[PDB]
Amino acid sequence: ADPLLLYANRRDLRLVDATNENATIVVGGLEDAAAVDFVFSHGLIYWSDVSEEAIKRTEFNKTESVQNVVVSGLLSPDGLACDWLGEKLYWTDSETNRIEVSNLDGSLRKVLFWQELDQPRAIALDPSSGFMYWTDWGEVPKIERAGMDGSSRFIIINSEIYWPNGLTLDYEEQKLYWADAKLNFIHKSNLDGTNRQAVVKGSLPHPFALTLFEDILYWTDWSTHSILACNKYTGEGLREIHSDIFSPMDIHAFSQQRQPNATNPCGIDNGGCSHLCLMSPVKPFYQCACPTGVKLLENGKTCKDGATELLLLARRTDLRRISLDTPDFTDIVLQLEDIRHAIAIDYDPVEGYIYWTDDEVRAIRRSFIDGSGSQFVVTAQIAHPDGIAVDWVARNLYWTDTGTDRIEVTRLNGTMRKILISEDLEEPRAIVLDPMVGYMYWTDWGEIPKIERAALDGSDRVVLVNTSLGWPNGLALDYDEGKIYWGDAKTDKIEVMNTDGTGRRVLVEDKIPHIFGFTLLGDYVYWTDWQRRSIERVHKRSAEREVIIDQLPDLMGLKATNVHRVIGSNPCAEENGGCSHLCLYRPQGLRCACPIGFELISDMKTCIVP
Amino acid sequence: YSCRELHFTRYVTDGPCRSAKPVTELVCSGQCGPARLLPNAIGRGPDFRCIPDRYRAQRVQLLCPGGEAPRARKVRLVASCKCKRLTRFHNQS
Ligand SMILES: *[C@@H]1O[C@H](CO[C@@H]2O[C@@H](C)[C@@H](O)[C@@H](O)[C@@H]2O)[C@@H](O[C@@H]2O[C@@H](C)[C@@H](O)[C@@H](O)[C@@H]2O)[C@H](O)[C@H]1NC(C)=O
Ligand SMILES: *[C@@H]1O[C@H](CO)[C@@H](O[C@@H]2O[C@H](CO)[C@@H](O)[C@H](O)[C@H]2NC(C)=O)[C@H](O)[C@H]1NC(C)=O
Ligand SMILES: *[C@@H]1O[C@H](CO)[C@@H](O)[C@H](O)[C@H]1NC(C)=O
Ligand SMILES: [Mg+2]
Ligand SMILES: [Mg+2]
Q1: Disulfide engineering: A598 pairs with which of A520, A532, A607, B38, CB 3.0-4.6 Å?
Q2: For B90, which of A32, A384, A471 is closest by C-beta distance?
Q3: Pocket of ligand 1 contains residue A22 by CB under 6 Å
Q4: What's the number of domains chain B is made of?
Q5: In which element (H, E) is residue A555 found?
Q6: Range(s) of the domain holding residue B65
């Protein structure tokens, strides 16, 4: 009969009446309902959950309103606000230190900010202008404002502020209300920070979320477990309206009159944008945007076909990709299932498949960059795959298993297994390939440490390096410069060599305690340091370094590669080189090969059983 | 408990030989528990167990049964206990 107050209670979403005190529950069964906003026109209620580490939505008009999982891959989503005009959704995260944005269906995640965000909290919108507002209570408490497009970010409050927990707008009067939980007040201001005048000066134990309606304020308090309410203009009338709350969190006035109808600059044609049509303050008041890691084309409207250069990573419990086209270096959590201990990883730009291993699942598996099409390649007779390599030309798969101390090979979809290197091998791991020349390269461990080399059939195995070797865990090749790069964890050092065995200089020696992951791509070399839980790059010609993500536990191995661009060919590509099963190229020419139980025939090409 | 330094005296041995005087070894016990919630943090990773921080080293003369002179030897023991991480052995499982 007047402003209904919707709030999150850590276990359910409730709705109180401001007049009287029967609270109707919206959605129960929650574990840690934190922040909440709504989209009244669409009739949706969005909320966050710091324990399920996700953001969910539901249609409050529909009965038995089942939830809709919107996001997953978050750490501590402390704040949330809905854009009821551009159909967008903004949230924060006090741990990963970022402010993302997406459509309502959780699609098109873009990180809008990651810099100088210590502990961001609450966020509010004004889509008719294209300005988002948020707070931070960490190292430097502040209230920032920025365009909903990710531009014109300016700190608008930095003086006399410590715990700016709650924040909301007065659209009717074009003002900004926030509440400080330690400094114990509620101040108002114009939408830039000017004329900051006091409203409520005393008597605030520990507020958390503020909301407004008509000439009356409403907010939650933690130390009182209640919802207070006062007058918007004067500090008079400090009231309790709803007391004895379990654990109140975020609250909004629930009425259509708090999301005023306004004209969308994106119009019907999504503003011409290929993907994201975000609100903006600059004319024409929208800006086209691309998901995280994908750069926008010259149109200023048309996104690119995925991200071009890409860095795929393997942790223990998840797989993650990092785009190299943008400086945000956001590690997208690849949405997959049953990854107990992922080890080695590789890619195939032809089909877009990611081949990774696991020593507790005992399987080599394969998925898209997205995370769809998760299939098992090799299921049985697998112990410890510490290294995997993709022959993108002959369409074959190589891996090393130190449990059996052997190296085998199949076609990319698991068929035609053949044991190549069985003997004279001591705990081998890393493996890279060069199908144009027809050599394979690999390393083993510190007892008889070496970087051996052989052909793709297991012939002319020539030990490449024998000196000053400790724990050669990684290997990579720069084909255009005929040099191979490796890295050691015992020597705490990483060096380079040419395939002729010409030069052998150390690249970086200073602070490389323990590299396991190792790859190369175009004048940069990426490595995964254990004991520092960090990833950095090194410039090839130079020696400059750039930390791309630090403090990431359970790091394993990575390989950087291009998407949909491949180079190199050899006789094996043309109709599999005439081979019935395996086409193992080598400088002497290709060599057709049969698996076990089959033998090679007189023509040296086909395979049948005896 | 909060990661204290417990002490107990022991002898040092090479089998049949035994040190003349004893030596107070220290044992890192306690419960270096996870830090509690920040005062304005939302409620609901790392492992920081009580580990030897710094080590000490002392010289104790070893004594063996009759017929041999008192050999001399140096042994290193624990000195302080902190809460750090663990990164040494390099393997898969
Ligand atoms: C869709 O829902 C709105 C708001 O409903 C409110 O929230 C849900 C979860 C229930 O708890 C309702 O009891 C709440 O009012 C309805 O808007 C209302 O419309 C009229 C009846 C008036 O009471 C107005 O103040 C409300 O906002 C809306 O009618 C409903 N859709 C349909 C088709 O009924
Ligand atoms: C992928 O698996 C499919 C079947 O699961 C196979 O493709 C064909 O398999 C038949 C039967 O062995 C062969 O005669 C064909 O030559 C295969 N097709 C091609 C294009 O080679 C095969 O085992 C796997 N590899 C490929 C490349 O298909
Ligand atoms: C490896 O060591 C043996 C003997 O220690 C030596 O003869 C051989 O040359 C070394 N490897 C290479 C590639 O030189
Ligand atoms: Mg909000
Ligand atoms: Mg932080």
Answers
A1: A607
A2: A471
A3: no
A4: 1
A5: strand A555-562
A6: 5-37+45-83
